[PDB]
Design an enzyme around this catalytic site. Structure first.
Site, mmCIF file in Angstrom:
data_model
loop_
_atom_site.group_PDB
_atom_site.id
_atom_site.type_symbol
_atom_site.label_atom_id
_atom_site.label_comp_id
_atom_site.label_asym_id
_atom_site.label_seq_id
_atom_site.Cartn_x
_atom_site.Cartn_y
_atom_site.Cartn_z
ATOM 1 C CB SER A 47 -0.968 0.009 1.167
ATOM 2 O OG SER A 47 -1.970 -0.993 1.042
ATOM 3 C CD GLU A 145 -7.460 -8.509 -6.299
ATOM 4 O OE1 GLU A 145 -8.343 -9.263 -5.830
ATOM 5 O OE2 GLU A 145 -7.537 -7.261 -6.301
#
Length: 270
Positions: A47, A145
């Protein structure tokens, strides 16, 4: 001893004990001095890409006034895992600014995916990073994903050096106009997820803009930060980890300790 040799030696010990690899790149913007460990090796972004996504959205706002105020309405049913903020506000929608605050400061996956849609996808974010001179960054997939972190897989990776250099250009330098640079810095400075990572190595009370990533597999997690001391020039620091074993948990402590080792080479100690 040369502080750079001490830092290398400390990082090698951290790697031995963790059982995986630690990529570091640090820039002291006062003197231009750097610290590097595996600077050109690929690591999954996880992230942490969301900090660069925010920059890409801000760049799009240069041509469309009002973008940050545009209200996005979105599916609740389709939100990905770890969408705490977008779940809460779905009945009202969220503005592009609010989505960036959630993406950057809580790592909200639904917010990041909506912002990717706004800028036309992972390939478009990659094109934006290429446009500022970052030849390494690539985003290929959506959240979650993009967290697969498979060893050697090039998708959704960058290098510690490219992350640090791009963070400098975007949050300190001139890659965005000043109002947008300030907004990016403010979003990063308000992160809530980084207190056990680079921030844990920074003297108390200094401002730190950072974005974390935690892939959840392969011991793969990271943080990149811009540190604004009150008495010296800003410092940029990227710390990325990976491990060959799928079941290995990440380690916040390893990230914080690697940050401490790099910052010590710049004569910063918390």
């Amino acid at each position: 001893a040369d502080p750079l040799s001490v830092a290398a030696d400390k990082l090698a010990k951290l790697e031995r004990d963790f059982g995986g690899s630690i990529g570091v790149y640090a820039i002291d913007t006062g003197s231009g001095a750097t610290v590097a460990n595996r600077p050109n090796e690929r690591f999954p972004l996880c992230s942490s890409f969301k900090g660069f996504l925010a920059a890409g959205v801000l760049a799009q706002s240069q041509d469309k006034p009002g973008l940050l105020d545009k209200r996005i309405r979105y599916s609740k049913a389709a939100l990905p895992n770890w969408s705490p903020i977008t779940t809460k506000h779905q009945a009202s929608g969220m503005t592009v600014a609010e989505l960036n605050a959630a993406s950057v400061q809580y790592s909200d996956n639904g917010a990041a995916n909506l912002l990717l849609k706004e800028i036309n996808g992972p390939a478009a974010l990659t094109t934006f990073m290429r446009s500022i001179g970052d030849a390494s960054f690539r985003l290929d997939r959506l959240e979650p994903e993009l967290n697969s972190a498979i060893p050697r897989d090039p998708r959704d990776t960058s290098t510690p050096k490219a992350v640090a250099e791009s963070a400098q250009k975007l949050a300190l330098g001139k890659a965005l106009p000043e109002p947008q640079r300030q907004q990016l810095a403010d979003w990063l400075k308000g992160n809530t997820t980084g207190n056990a990572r680079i921030r844990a190595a920074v003297p108390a009370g200094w401002e730190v803009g950072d974005k974390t990533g935690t892939c959840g597999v392969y011991g793969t997690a990271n943080d990149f930060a811009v540190i604004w001391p009150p008495k010296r020039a800003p410092i940029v620091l990227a710390v990325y980890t990976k491990h060959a074993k799928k079941e290995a948990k990440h380690s916040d402590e390893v990230i914080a300790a690697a940050a401490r080792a790099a910052l010590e080479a710049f004569n910063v100690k918390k």
